[model samples]
Target chain A: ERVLKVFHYFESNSEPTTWASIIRHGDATDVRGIIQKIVDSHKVKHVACYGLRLSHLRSEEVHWLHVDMGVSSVREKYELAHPPEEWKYELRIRYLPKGFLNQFTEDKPTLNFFYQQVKSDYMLEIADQVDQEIALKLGCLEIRRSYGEMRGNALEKKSNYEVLEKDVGLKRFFPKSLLDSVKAKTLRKLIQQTFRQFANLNREESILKFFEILSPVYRFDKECFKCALGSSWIISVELAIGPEEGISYLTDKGCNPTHLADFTQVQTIQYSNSEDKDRKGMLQLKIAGAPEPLTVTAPSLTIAENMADLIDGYCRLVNGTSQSFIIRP
Target chain B: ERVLKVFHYFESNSEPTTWASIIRHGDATDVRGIIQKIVDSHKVKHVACYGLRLSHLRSEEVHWLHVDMGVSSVREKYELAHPPEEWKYELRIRYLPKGFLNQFTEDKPTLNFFYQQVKSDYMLEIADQVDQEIALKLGCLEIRRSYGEMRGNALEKKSNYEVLEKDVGLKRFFPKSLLDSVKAKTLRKLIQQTFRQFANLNREESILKFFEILSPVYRFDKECFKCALGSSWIISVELAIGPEEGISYLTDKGCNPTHLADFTQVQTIQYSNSEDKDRKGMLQLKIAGAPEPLTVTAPSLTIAENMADLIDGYCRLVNGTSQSFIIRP
Candidate 1:
């Protein structure tokens, strides 16, 4: 009877809110179990709990199993709800207007059509042009290096990094399923138009500049913070560089380079707790001509704070915005 | 006794690097007492331990009394050392020239003055001039606000932060005892020369440009990451914004908006974890005309990461440098 009453209590709300609301009306001791029973029976089409969405009965305990429906909005609204520790940007559209509205569905014709079209028109034209230009430049560099070698000059050999860095543009061309087709269309058009506007621009600068603009707009599946800062919106962060040496880098090539690497490049900074003996602060720096990222030991928290300030200041300047950057001391 | 052997064992080493070294040689059971005896009876003029610099015996135990000499440096060097959880930039120099050559020793003025005078002359004058100019500018800003209040146009309010931020410049002028004076003189000379070169530049632009160059060089009484990024040097960081809301900003004025205010402007971004309930993320922004910092809430970590990138990129561009910015996903 009590279980039914608790179930009825949630159903009566009309606008189901959170578990805390349920706790207020139902017995705290049994609310979890009652919710579990309701979830199992499939009585409700959609039930939103504290941080979970239930389609089937799920248990709630110290560490329970449930789908995180409130990964972003819901967790943000309810202060008590634990935020998602790890999430990525994803976008998928059920329908695509041929290639205009990109479809991420499993069907082959649409997928293959969009994929082939994007690869040929966008990737091959823009990226291949830049790639060729880079190859020419790199060839020049190699000739210079060989000349120096013959002269017995200790020349700094350019690593694959120079070419690897340019490869970021290629990543955009290889469309992923999560990138929303509609938004991609707009971005695609923007890139196409930007290229056309700067038609006379250097092939290298054209692709590089397009990427500089696009990176902030589209990440995995959604718009990124670049848009927020571009529009004068601000961001507050709660994480820090993990106090360990195995820190990794997030680059166009995906997550590569660990703390022990010689040269690695990354775009954003996020740290987690993982330690063999004790936690320590570690960061990576991309050094040209080096095969792996330069491992940096964050000597102090203050040092890290200063690093954060420098990074933020640089980002704003590149994004064509000028808002003073501040981090709580 | 084992204590004496431990003490003598440390004595045998020509140079004792850290306290842990002493503990390793001495009986762990009697290290506390052994160190105490060594300090009480001055067998050595000075002893450098891991966390403490001992001229005499001092106990190292649970909340025990001991001086922390390597607290900042050693702790900073070892990733395992708990970093300064909270540190703010602060400087109070009676004469920056003297602060340049760190002399915490209580000595006569001539000793310090001669130590300073030998360095250079132009550096001395340039720093003083710019220091005076900043004071004048700040004074003018304050006066304008007062004058506007009398005329009633809702005259722009001056936050204590305006004074506080300038205090950072003052810190630069009044060098500290720890900073190498020779290095300080060179830096001071560099700033003076830069200012002279840009003498005909816009007043606002001149000061900002100066800071853009300076901030990268000096922070927390030391040369900063700018050097790492300056000589075709680059830093690659891995991080991102979390998907959430309630991002707050830190600005010249305190959190002015109080989560209920409006019409604020920001120039840069900074974040910290200073909450008691849990280390939640907080950010600060320079507000345009709200008389104080416009506090912001970053709904997610990825957003904050973008802000950092934008700010860092902007600082580099304004300072006339080009480097790739990266963060980990």
Candidate 2:
């Protein structure tokens, strides 16, 4: 038998230490989502490097990597005795609060209450919102014409790909149960909503979401040549368009325009990967936030040459009247 | 007098993010799909994902953490000052065009193209046709990778990144003026396209296009991640249908089913600063977009139980159909 030695500290019942207990969690689906929570945390470390390499992986194998390794491998690996210590990293996982009211409105006190009151089955309603949003936005990608769950990753390169070559470590293994769960009406709807959210991706900003465990079993940090594979603390971050650059602004016509004048890109370089020589080891200076912009002293004639072309081009174009209408506006 | 001075070392010859470069030079509308000829040697690093703890960012006088400090620092701390290293680091500027096409098809090369050319941009039109197959394969992620430019290193993550985000140093002492030579048509289109591309994004996946550079920059290895990111590599793999995994023959009968397995995801794990330190120095697991599942020793009752639910639900309702629906079919 695996080591069954449990550290049982003898304590009288009268001792007022809080007793540990496991409760039959919320609902079945919620419990399942809990399982998914575990899956998300481990998925990153498992697949980040350990993912199967493809020589010519076919749609199925590719998908196996995507669904199995991409989705489940982290979960599987997390369950493994050893996973990246980072994979076990814990962060609060909650459905992003919806239907925002004023913070002082005295509506929902805490997200826990909102989360509890909202039934898991209600994800279907949310799924509808997700689905419609996807359908409307994804016309450019022809999402509606596409079938859900039917498409494979291989179709990306050669649309009519008939030959599928498998890649190493790219097979998808799901317990008959999870696949069954995915097919459940509610789950299926969730799946569809999830898919639509991805497929109908048409928006100004992007978000990257990952699953995580509520509480982690292990935590450690290290600086090694290569990252260790383990169930370590999992941390996910969404790096978005920063405040200084590439943000859109609404014009008088209600249209949003993107221009350099409107925004500037500020650098926030993370020197996380810089190589350390020894204890006080150091590398060239790298910054993780907006730093100074440097300039070379030499002047070039090409600047003038290019500027001439630009001015000439702009001068030639007539707005609205149509003398070489480069821009409609 | 201005304390900071800027300069440019680049030959006026290179126009990094120009429309003509993207459409004509970058060959966005290359009829040949001139993918083989397009060299991704031009590496211009736009600023991305720079962060520091807000606490560390505080000082009596405002101080920036310096995103690209590896290269430059203030010669003297001032509201506007050049980087400290006078001789140590040199800086240059590069441009990226926004008016590019999502040209999975040749139909509409640009928004304003005439009706005839638009008609020709059909998915099947280029089937077995000329220099390059011209299907309007919206999944041009791979093509973008191959055709896109690079600088000092391949666009693989964790590869040589300094060249990826090189700064375009500017100065005031040089006393040179830059007349912007950017094409009006290209500029306007770039603006509109950039706006539309971002505004149209409604979900997370739509943002995939913007992050295409991640795969080329990081070389993460997963086709699903790369493909979704517009790596242009998924064009060749075929999806399969079978009980045993690996790609294979879909039953000719092709089960006509109501629901299709419609989606898959690619997950990437970036290490965090803390975890990165312990792992021999690399960015810690940062973003986990899609989590893989947990593999099990005994087929994990979790999956089995989940499958039971599916068999009881959707699969049983299919009425024992021998044939199943494929995505394209």
Candidate 3:
């Protein structure tokens, strides 16, 4: 039998394409056209935005675990790391309590819509398939924890009662949004409250909390946090004000941190829930350090502090409820 | 008029095939099959790879970059360090050398083969095209350096050349039966001699003389060097013996550095001529910290060292040739 010959061509002599836009007009579309031709010729099966994305396997679901093996097998030239490695058996076991999975749907409009419309049980099944795919491809051996959110803050899922409907003489709260507003102290409070409310919170909560503290939400770029905006400035602003520190980062910059504060405007203008607002909000923001006025910064900070209080308050509220766990020796 | 009507339908999840493998059996055919199905349903107007090979993109690419659009751009998630801002300028000056394009043939078996077959001028043109593709995707502002193969050390090519001519002396002055039996030092001496002969030198040569004095060759795995083989054992053996105190690292191993005199049994097995019998000679004896054994760790280190040596040696040898460059400028 003849050995099939394959050639791996690499050029380290010169950089690939000029960083500058080579095509004078319609760059994205034109480049896409050129790529399409290559794909058709090479019979390319998939595409990605970066080399890192090149190795992600695709499976039968909308999650990372299901990355298709055909896709997963693609080679990366820049990766100096050796072939995939597994953690020691004991270490893997010990880490069981410190890991969790978060499944965010694709950021594109279609996938986002698909994420929301999918049936509860099917989504769970898809999540399972994806989890298995990721674990296997990453050489994870086994999954320690997993979480799927239909809607709401991932942090406060079981913590603080579901504030779905307005309570009598009560607060109008949303875990989905509230989780985004809080910081380190509040994050722990929320986790503790979740345990209190649900009774025996799973190990998954511990993992998520740890990730929250250590891996800046920005680390989630594309996977965890995607911008939903038209202007670059707003993208910048929203990104900047993600966690409490991010919010603080933006607020200090004196931009509308909330609505209308502009870096160009020296004197911060107060948004008067008042009539005539003349500023046009158009620039793209990357959410750098703090930028915004008292109304935006103060309220966000206050809301964050309030969330901590709410989580603690939920624990008290849970104690007042009738349910209790009895220990058996 | 239709306020996110499609978005509402997004809630309805469906795929045409559930069992059809997306990463079908690790083959591009299987992947194309899956992509064809997905594209058919979506009626995607534009699908592209941005210089990314589709075969390389995995399911994770979809989950992380495509589906996870709601999360972030691939650039953000990976924390890809942006090239320096000034690099943008390199783009203006970078261009494909025109000669490479004038001679390229699509009928070539492989792109690299085409490159190799083409004249230097033509290769430059094709290189530019590849470079442009790479650069645009990588976002280089400028072209600081280019890519090319590290030249020289045509070992495999030389082997083929010798096979074509039945020229054993041209290779290592060994009869076919003794080919494998010769010491690597002998091989190096032959190599230097061949180099001189090709460059046409018979008189005592400076570069060749230097190599003779520095007859480096052999295997020195950790076991052989530090403990198991022990410096004293080899140094105490019979047969051709020499002092073992010259090299710095070896001298550090104390008075009894492992010497070649130890391994007489393996040495005697080597063949010297066709009359010595056997199709190929016995295994060659090796020394510590030499280049001849050609192990897995050869290429990179050897290439770098060879380049430096070539510049030094070539300057001397070429100066003796009639067509030598003078250093007047």
Candidate 4:
């Protein structure tokens, strides 16, 4: 029996601690079949939302195994950058917080592990304010978790900062400006009073609250890249591609996103496949609502091809429609 | 010492009209002589720093008549648009500078004209937060300058908000983030206390100091034209023509300008100007070898001609060249 030892973030240390693995999926090499095996064994109800990624404990850059790719390739790819002893495979979040927030079943183990992943990302500075809010809310959840799950009304004499400083440290618990601008005396007092005032909730209830309170300004549940897009023949703008909604751009007026092609209305996905070092990327979509083809120029070829795969993957996930990606070599 | 008919900011509108008159600059029409007349007569001591423009209050848009062509031609040009009486001329600060402050004399008229122009731009918001802090500091300086010499510390008990709101108003003093931050009452009080704590400075001294204490910003020291500049055969970047620093190209990593050409080292400056509506302009510089001639495709024929004129201008200006600008039309 091939035992693929699976792990999730340990709540205490934010490390890749062992979670029970499926001995049955030893033969499952296909991505979809492996995902199905994972969903059934782990009881992860949101199949499209959660994705399998091969992660390493120390590396922020993870090899996102495409839904088309099997385990064997990523293992080799992951092993190439990192040795077998260091590789940690994760069946974690893909789309983003909303994907999990919108889920039908509140699986505690699933949530508990997700919390650790998010906390690790927050701690590593791999996340931002949306996590800033959610992570701090989780810290408050920690306050509720410690007090309600354990004992009665009278709390420990130590201050909340004294307690939580050792728990996950203070950075997770406050917004950047709040932490930077406010004095520790005032902030600790606020935290201590807040923890005392917090309604008693179990770990699942509060971690679920952490999920519910996720804030705005995210790159989305989608992978993003720095891009320059030509919305018209004469005009091109620097834009960020992600957080699943639409293409966002910065201009003198301010930051705003224009549109992402509705995969349903998607007409043609045209792209460039040039081998030149500088001119390696372009993604053009002949989609509806746009008068002309909307095109994004990526900084690199690999990202452009990966963009094509994701565009196709997103379309497939949304409506099960396969769109032909026409590459102009 | 000199007289010039100088008009500034007509408060009722964003119009170029007669704010006042100076009889002296009747003889001084040379751009430098005329600017000197303006600075002295208007009490703007920042010399060679201001220029006169034959602005027409025509067609709702104010036309800033270039000083190079002088009065008679612009009057002829103005008459072609509207009748003579409809003309509005403004002797304004053309070059806003620290260069003025570096000069031996601090002329009040020059500084005043510069201050008026600064106020006009700030009021109209040709500015931003760096602006807010500096402009507010200017307002504080204005308070100190305003309240003193003519009279002692005001018995007029206007709230800082009320006084500042009427003077140039409060919006100019604060950055967008700060105005959006920490509440308005606290902000206004800070302004009042700053005005109270401020030192009294004379008009020339204050405005020259305004020029001296000017914040860091200003994109183009050289005339810039948008171009698709190709450094290598296969690579073309959306760049700008700022010759002193060579060409600056936009990429994923912010801005960096490199490789300025020696005027003597220049082999050829070849530019193409065509009648075709789309393909109107191309400029090629055959210098700074070790690679191909850097070719630039400008967006317009007019711009391409200007680019040629500028390339020739740079060579002529730098080399004191009788060398002709070669255009491939």
Best prediction by lDDT: 4
Q: lDDT for every model?
A: 0.28, 0.21, 0.22, 0.51
Chain B TM-scores per candidate, in order, are 0.17, 0.17, 0.14, 0.53
Listed per model in order, the count of residue pairs whose N, CA or C atoms clash below 3 Å is: 97, 135, 81, 19
Per-residue CA lDDT of model 4 for A34-113, tens digit only, reads: 66676566556445545566666786555555665656655556578777778766666554322444343355545665
Better candidate by TM-score, 3 or 4: 4
Question: Candidates' DockQ values?
Answer: 0.01, 0.01, 0.00, 0.00
Docking class of 1: incorrect
Tens digits of per-residue lDDT, candidate 1, A1-329, equal: 12122212222223222212221223233223434444444333112211122111222212111121222232243324432332111111111121122122233333332233322334334433333333233222322322332121221223422242244432433333212333634533433333333434343343334333433322211111110011123222212211111222333343232342210112233222223454533433443233553333343333343343333333232222222222221
True contacts kept of each: 0.00, 0.00, 0.00, 0.00
Write candidate 1's Cα lDDT for B1-329 as tens digits. Answer: 12111212222214321212222222222222334343333222111110122111222211111221222332233324322332211111111111322221111222222222221221333433334444323233322322232322222234432342354333423333223343634543333333333434443333334333433322212111110111123222222111110122223352222132221122355644425353433445454454555333333443433344333333322222222222222
TM-scores, all candidates, are: 0.16, 0.15, 0.15, 0.39
**Of the candidates numbered 1 and 2, which has the greater DockQ value?**
2
Q: Model 2: per-residue lDDT, tens digit, A1-329? A: 11111111112243212211222223222222333333343332111111111111222211011112222333344336443332321212121111111110232222222222221212223323333323222221222222232243423433322222133110111122333434434533433344444453321111111001100211001000111111134222111111122222223332323332111121111112213342221111111122432111111222222222221122121000001111110
Cand. 4 Cα-lDDT: 0.51
Query: What local lDDT score does residue A26 receive in model 1, on the 0 to 100 scale?
Result: 34
- Listed for every candidate in order, the interface RMSD values in angstroms are 23.1, 25.0, 36.0, 31.1
Off by over 4 Å in 4: A1-28, A55-62, A77-88, A96-100, A104-116, A126-138, A145-147, A150-188, A200-205, A208-223, A231-256, A267-272, A286-293, A320-329, B1-329
Tens digit of per-residue lDDT, candidate 3, span A60-136: 21111111112212222212332323110000000000011222111232222112222121223332333322212
- RMSD list, candidates in order: 27.7, 32.0, 32.5, 31.0
